[PDB]
Amino acid sequence: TKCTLKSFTVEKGIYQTSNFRVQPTESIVRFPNITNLCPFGEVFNATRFASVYAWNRKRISNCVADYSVLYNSASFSTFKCYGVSPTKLNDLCFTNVYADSFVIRGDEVRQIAPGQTGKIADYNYKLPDDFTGCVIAWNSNNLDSKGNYNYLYRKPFERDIYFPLQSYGFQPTNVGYQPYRVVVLSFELLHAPATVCGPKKSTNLVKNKCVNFNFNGLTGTGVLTESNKKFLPFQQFGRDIADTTDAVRDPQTLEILDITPCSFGGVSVITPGTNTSNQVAVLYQGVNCTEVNVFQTRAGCLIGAEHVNNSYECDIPIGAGICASYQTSQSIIAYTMSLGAENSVAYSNNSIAIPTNFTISVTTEILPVSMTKTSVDCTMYICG
Amino acid sequence: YTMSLGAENSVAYSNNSIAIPTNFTISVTTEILPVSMTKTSVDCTMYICGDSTECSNLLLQYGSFCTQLNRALTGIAVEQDKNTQEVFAQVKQIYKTPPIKDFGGFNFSQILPDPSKPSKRSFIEDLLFNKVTKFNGLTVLPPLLTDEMIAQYTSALLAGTITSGWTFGAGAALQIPFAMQMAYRFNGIGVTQNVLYENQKLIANQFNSAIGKIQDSLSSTASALGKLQDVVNQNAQALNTLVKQLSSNFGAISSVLNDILSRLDKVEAEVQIDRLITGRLQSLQTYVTQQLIRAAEIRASANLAATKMSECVLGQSKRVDFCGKGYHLMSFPQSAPHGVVFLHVTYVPAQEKNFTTAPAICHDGKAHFPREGVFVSNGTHWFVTQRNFYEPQIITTDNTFVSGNCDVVIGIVNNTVYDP
Amino acid sequence: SALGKLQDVVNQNAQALNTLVKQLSSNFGAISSVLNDILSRLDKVEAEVQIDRLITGRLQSLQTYVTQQLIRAAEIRASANLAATKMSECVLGQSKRVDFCGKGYHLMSFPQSAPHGVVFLHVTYVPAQEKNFTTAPAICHDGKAHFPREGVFVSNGTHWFVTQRNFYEPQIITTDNTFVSGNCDVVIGIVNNTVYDP
Amino acid sequence: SALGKLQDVVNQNAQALNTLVKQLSSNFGAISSVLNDILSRLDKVEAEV
Amino acid sequence: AYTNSFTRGVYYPDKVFRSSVLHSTQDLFLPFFSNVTWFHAIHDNPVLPFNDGVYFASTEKSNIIRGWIFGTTLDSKTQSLLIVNNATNVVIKVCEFQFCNDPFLGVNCTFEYVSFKNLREFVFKNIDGYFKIYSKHTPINLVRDLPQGFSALEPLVDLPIGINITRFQTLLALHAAYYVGYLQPRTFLLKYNENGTITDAVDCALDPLSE
Ligand SMILES: *[C@@H]1O[C@H](CO)[C@@H](O[C@@H]2O[C@H](CO)[C@@H](O)[C@H](O)[C@H]2NC(C)=O)[C@H](O)[C@H]1NC(C)=O
Ligand SMILES: *[C@@H]1O[C@H](CO)[C@@H](O[C@@H]2O[C@H](CO)[C@@H](O)[C@H](O)[C@H]2NC(C)=O)[C@H](O)[C@H]1NC(C)=O
Ligand SMILES: *[C@@H]1O[C@H](CO)[C@@H](O[C@@H]2O[C@H](CO)[C@@H](O)[C@H](O)[C@H]2NC(C)=O)[C@H](O)[C@H]1NC(C)=O
Ligand SMILES: *[C@@H]1O[C@H](CO)[C@@H](O[C@@H]2O[C@H](CO)[C@@H](O)[C@H](O)[C@H]2NC(C)=O)[C@H](O)[C@H]1NC(C)=O
Ligand SMILES: *[C@@H]1O[C@H](CO)[C@@H](O[C@@H]2O[C@H](CO)[C@@H](O)[C@H](O)[C@H]2NC(C)=O)[C@H](O)[C@H]1NC(C)=O
Ligand SMILES: *[C@@H]1O[C@H](CO)[C@@H](O[C@@H]2O[C@H](CO)[C@@H](O)[C@H](O)[C@H]2NC(C)=O)[C@H](O)[C@H]1NC(C)=O
Ligand SMILES: *[C@@H]1O[C@H](CO)[C@@H](O[C@@H]2O[C@H](CO)[C@@H](O)[C@H](O)[C@H]2NC(C)=O)[C@H](O)[C@H]1NC(C)=O
Ligand SMILES: *[C@@H]1O[C@H](CO)[C@@H](O)[C@H](O)[C@H]1NC(C)=O
Ligand SMILES: *[C@@H]1O[C@H](CO)[C@@H](O)[C@H](O)[C@H]1NC(C)=O
Ligand SMILES: *[C@@H]1O[C@H](CO)[C@@H](O)[C@H](O)[C@H]1NC(C)=O
Ligand SMILES: *[C@@H]1O[C@H](CO)[C@@H](O)[C@H](O)[C@H]1NC(C)=O
Ligand SMILES: *[C@@H]1O[C@H](CO)[C@@H](O)[C@H](O)[C@H]1NC(C)=O
Ligand SMILES: *[C@@H]1O[C@H](CO)[C@@H](O)[C@H](O)[C@H]1NC(C)=O
Ligand SMILES: *[C@@H]1O[C@H](CO)[C@@H](O)[C@H](O)[C@H]1NC(C)=O
Ligand SMILES: *[C@@H]1O[C@H](CO)[C@@H](O)[C@H](O)[C@H]1NC(C)=O
Ligand SMILES: *[C@@H]1O[C@H](CO)[C@@H](O)[C@H](O)[C@H]1NC(C)=O
Ligand SMILES: *[C@@H]1O[C@H](CO)[C@@H](O)[C@H](O)[C@H]1NC(C)=O
Ligand SMILES: *[C@@H]1O[C@H](CO)[C@@H](O)[C@H](O)[C@H]1NC(C)=O
Ligand SMILES: *[C@@H]1O[C@H](CO)[C@@H](O)[C@H](O)[C@H]1NC(C)=O
Ligand SMILES: *[C@@H]1O[C@H](CO)[C@@H](O)[C@H](O)[C@H]1NC(C)=O
């Protein structure tokens, strides 16, 4: 409370000091139970690559992918990535991976990015102007050069078949004019079943308890619970209004689980004045006391105060009719507030009360009229 | 179509014509006021950053924005209890009604508490409670007063208003018979109080029947609750917009923060997350600005409702059309979700007759003027009567006062003026 | 603590200014919050990006301050029109408006200045020492019902008096205190007495 | 100037609209405040910045 | 011939569960109450342009409509998609070997793939190198035409064929009726019920009430 106010003195009140959250008990990993190694050695050490006028494409599915072996390979002249970072590729997983495989001149590699245009990139191989994945390339001059005019050049992901047939004199004596093998990995980050995943091992599954979790690369924290939700066979994930994942289909047992965020609330510290006591009582707002002397209010769980059956004027307000005060050998009491002294008016069809005497009150009403006439020289405030 | 502004009416004016109402209708013109919007409060770090430490370490670089948003929302949330306390808690004793309801023919049994309810609302409060209708760091705090405590304050105000009238606004409540309280309220509208007693069963039946029409109106017609349901809907749409805004890209690669933290390493993730922070924070400042301006609108409505409670429930208002469309008699508060409802009881005059009138009357060459009310003639005899209920009286030295010879007055008439 | 309305208006503005001043020290994602560091450390291309984050943040924080101060100025202006209205109705006059001019039946108010505000010493009559009386809406005499001009009828238990509504001052009931209207039989709860003819 | 409050209300709203219209011409750190200058000069990916 | 499409031709826009929500979407869709071109299997399969994309359907109890072709020339002057159903499999090809150039079925495989009382429905669309197919099967008692009532199509397959498509055709089998409607870029509003099934939709460009 003193650090909330930045003050060594705190007046009688109730201060929203902190945000209580039940912590993740353990970390859960849920991945597809499949173990076949992906064909990257076939992709990168292929007999030949395709010509860029009609580039090869291969689909990678139902397999395990350690991208670290690729990212760590100093043989790659570039490893430029988009919408993912090379270090993160193991942590996360995909419905498919596609490898687009072809040879180009090194001077043209600058055209292979999600926004370019050029005599290759507006023609025979256009990346989507928002693509997600990695471009992996290196000079193959030690193998693909001869020159090797078999290598041939010319909508997003358009294949195609005066005529525009053009070829490269790839010779071992060429450095920008060398042949460069390139593989573009496009990652199908849709919400179907995952089929290409990192070597990250699955754990056992935990339920009804607050955990950190991963499902196919959906990292989060929450209480996993079994659910009645009628997921259709093509849907692996389900979402709330906020686009936050609200449910998941488990990748190994295929049952439908809710995700509920772990119990949380404000930590309102009820205090008498520090100029009166050091003693405090804590309202965990909205939580049930089983989740945290102790007392339960409709406003939350109240700890360190003492419940009282008498009723008094509301000294510090807590909520839902509960109030607190510091009182007699002394404690913070908490009580249902008195609205006032109860009074049956002595009515009848023929009774009247008339005041035989009065008093002159002088009250005191204290109204603001003018706040301070501040003015800010906004250029000097911003630019000094 | 070109809208009708209303039925056109040539008021039948002339320098000697007056219309006096010969009968009245008591009418219970319901008014509704918001008093307190939902006490929303936000964990601005869980909203903006979703318990990512990686994001929270960036949100710190924005300084006292997140803390002053909590401060601002708490300033609204604490003043919702100020509003509710200033409207309803205008009484330091909980008055309660007698066991026997001997109120001179008036039947409050629909506006007083019913023991049959689990929280002891009246019947009309229970109609009003029928007609009026996340995990994302957002919360709703409870009101300080429960709706049961609100119903005890409206019962204290109402048991006071019934058994003691205006007097509990000043001192302690003074009991007075309800048939004698209305003879105060009739003097407040300038209607001579015998107009109550000589019509007491009729006035009681018009009040009872008007209360019955409020039960039918509130049972049949949802658009009666228009303001309160709109204040619930405005805050619900404000929260649903604030929640939907978590799905907005703001120019980041995704709006789900854990997509960015799983896909991107920290050097790149810090660029994208700073767009989600900038966007979500702009949307939280937009929400809090909207809620502050809306809370000033509800606070104007709460200070209006507290003024209506003070003048119109705890008293009787001379302020024309402040207390419903009529001459105001008294009002009964009823609670409703997020607001208050006033059953403003008003005298409205009804069955008019035309009369010939004169500003003064000559007797022995000396002009007489009325003490209370106006002069009128049915066509053959001259009478004095009160302004708001035709009650013809013989013109005399007791209902009139002299002021000098006739000749100065435009439109004076001769008559006799009698001396008791 | 009686000054809480005024001291809180001073505190709100002082806390808003301290918040606005502290926001000069916030990074907003720039390498320092002291502008002269950026201009001494970075050359006038790289620095121009960092300064744009400080301008964006400081300007957003100034707009946050001015929005808060406009909403707070409207909150004070409602209080100023309320104070001006109590000055007009309650100082320059007397108010029939129940519980506007403080608790009680209002007599008069004296204004006093205070820093950033005004204080009204509302002087009010409060009735204090009740007696319980038998009462009636009307009184019969010679078949005529009589009603009071000002005040109410009451009895101590043996004699009937008319008295003003707000201070027990019993008076012998007479035709100067009361007005006739019609026969007895229409009135629920009329009582007999004698009404004296002075 | 007897109409000073109404002329002030017209002036405030007109100056608020003229401010909002002039703010179309403010650069905000972009290469032009005329949107069509950006869409004519830059290829339509760099232009997104 | 022509007939009215009514509200038919809506499909699940993405592979994500939602429930009790009015999710808005913008995509290639069959415009509400547009004219569908209509055909009879007996005594009717010309080549049609493909445009933005194609809704297709057939009303059936005999299984005579059995495939589709998509491309620019549809004749192996250049590669073109073939789709066939053979009553044990769905089969898909782009192979160079010559097609039935007056197409009916007698009762370089560089891409190759394998998986009235009824109305069978489809949506076919091409975006950014991927062809996509959606479908629905439903019973009908109204043998006359496409029902004036609602159901939504669900995705079958995504096909990374990379080929340019501007014309299509349909295939019939012999020793039934079929429909065509072109899609357009449209905003749509969708209602997902308490089970996450789409029970209703709005075409946002239909009429001022839908706007
Ligand atoms: C006051 O009004 C209530 C209804 O507003 C009356 O309630 C009725 O009471 C009788 C029995 O005494 C029942 O037969 C009716 O069905 C009740 N009506 C309802 C709607 O509940 C009550 O009797 C009235 N009392 C007086 C003295 O007027
Ligand atoms: C004043 O108006 C009321 C109606 O607002 C009259 O009361 C009605 O009188 C008729 C017979 O004349 C009865 O059938 C109704 O039942 C009465 N209504 C009520 C609510 O009691 C009243 O008689 C009129 N009085 C005068 C003097 O004109
Ligand atoms: C105007 O009012 C007076 C009094 O109500 C009426 O005068 C009475 O008329 C009746 C016959 O209709 C006589 O029996 C009474 O003796 C008259 N009273 C007096 C005091 O003379 C008069 O008739 C009314 N005139 C009109 C046009 O309505
Ligand atoms: C009221 O009555 C008086 C008489 O009591 C009228 O006064 C006479 O008016 C005529 C014409 O102006 C004069 O010739 C007489 O000399 C007046 N007599 C007196 C005694 O003054 C008067 O005109 C009447 N007025 C009205 C408005 O009826
Ligand atoms: C009610 O008030 C009247 C007047 O104050 C009281 O009557 C007087 O009583 C005294 C004796 O106590 C007599 O000397 C007077 O002559 C009485 N006055 C009259 C007008 O008769 C009466 O005693 C009071 N009664 C009660 C019950 O308080
Ligand atoms: C007020 O006094 C009158 C007499 O002055 C009472 O009238 C008598 O009432 C009884 C019962 O109703 C009748 O038998 C008599 O015939 C009435 N007398 C006359 C002259 O009419 C009247 O009851 C008294 N009322 C109260 C409330 O005290
Ligand atoms: C897809 O196919 C269409 C033809 O169906 C191609 O469009 C023609 O392109 C040539 C130039 O190459 C133009 O001269 C023609 O006028 C176009 N015809 C039509 C009907 O548009 C289109 O270029 C092809 N696109 C790709 C990416 O292969
Ligand atoms: C390609 O072959 C070399 C040996 O010739 C091997 O070291 C390398 O790991 C292979 N690449 C991949 C992706 O497996
Ligand atoms: C996945 O593996 C578990 C054992 O780890 C096995 O029980 C389960 O049946 C498997 N699921 C599928 C769909 O093969
Ligand atoms: C605070 O404590 C000091 C003594 O330590 C005392 O003089 C002062 O009056 C106290 N003030 C309050 C508000 O309790
Ligand atoms: C508190 O939680 C327990 C389960 O831990 C439950 O049985 C009890 O009903 C809850 N009470 C309230 C008031 O939420
Ligand atoms: C309060 O009163 C109830 C009975 O009304 C009793 O059971 C309970 O033990 C009391 N609690 C305390 C704290 O005295
Ligand atoms: C009064 O009489 C005039 C006669 O022209 C008539 O126009 C007017 O409507 C009448 N008003 C009432 C209330 O009877
Ligand atoms: C009223 O006005 C008429 C003309 O409109 C005039 O003849 C008549 O004398 C006037 N009477 C009075 C009392 O002014
Ligand atoms: C009036 O008398 C009744 C008699 O029961 C009593 O209950 C009530 O408290 C008295 N009121 C005052 C203000 O003395
Ligand atoms: C007052 O009510 C009682 C019943 O409580 C009744 O006996 C008495 O006659 C009534 N008196 C009047 C004046 O209404
Ligand atoms: C549908 O086709 C008919 C002729 O078959 C034509 O009259 C009508 O305008 C068309 N309507 C639409 C919406 O295409
Ligand atoms: C259907 O097609 C597949 C692939 O061509 C084939 O294996 C299967 O035998 C075919 N079925 C029939 C009935 O010919
Ligand atoms: C297969 O493709 C190559 C070009 O990639 C072409 O030369 C060859 O003729 C094609 N074969 C057939 C059977 O069409
Ligand atoms: C959800 O599906 C069940 C059958 O699995 C059905 O009983 C229920 O009625 C459906 N929900 C709605 C909103 O109809």
mmCIF file with all atom_site columns, C-alpha atoms in Angstrom, chain B residues 6-13 352:
data_model
loop_
_atom_site.group_PDB
_atom_site.id
_atom_site.type_symbol
_atom_site.label_atom_id
_atom_site.label_alt_id
_atom_site.label_comp_id
_atom_site.label_asym_id
_atom_site.label_entity_id
_atom_site.label_seq_id
_atom_site.pdbx_PDB_ins_code
_atom_site.Cartn_x
_atom_site.Cartn_y
_atom_site.Cartn_z
_atom_site.occupancy
_atom_site.B_iso_or_equiv
_atom_site.pdbx_formal_charge
_atom_site.auth_seq_id
_atom_site.auth_comp_id
_atom_site.auth_asym_id
_atom_site.auth_atom_id
_atom_site.pdbx_PDB_model_num
ATOM 1 C CA . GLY B 1 6   ? -49.097 18.788 -32.538 1.00 0.00 ? 6   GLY B CA 1
ATOM 2 C CA . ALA B 1 7   ? -52.826 19.450 -32.953 1.00 0.00 ? 7   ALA B CA 1
ATOM 3 C CA . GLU B 1 8   ? -53.335 23.159 -33.816 1.00 0.00 ? 8   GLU B CA 1
ATOM 4 C CA . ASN B 1 9   ? -55.422 25.152 -31.278 1.00 0.00 ? 9   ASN B CA 1
ATOM 5 C CA . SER B 1 10  ? -56.885 28.668 -31.430 1.00 0.00 ? 10  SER B CA 1
ATOM 6 C CA . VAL B 1 11  ? -56.991 29.497 -27.685 1.00 0.00 ? 11  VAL B CA 1
ATOM 7 C CA . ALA B 1 12  ? -60.314 31.374 -27.357 1.00 0.00 ? 12  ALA B CA 1
ATOM 8 C CA . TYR B 1 13  ? -58.762 34.579 -25.899 1.00 0.00 ? 13  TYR B CA 1
ATOM 9 C CA . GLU B 1 352 ? -63.216 23.345 -18.106 1.00 0.00 ? 352 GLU B CA 1
#
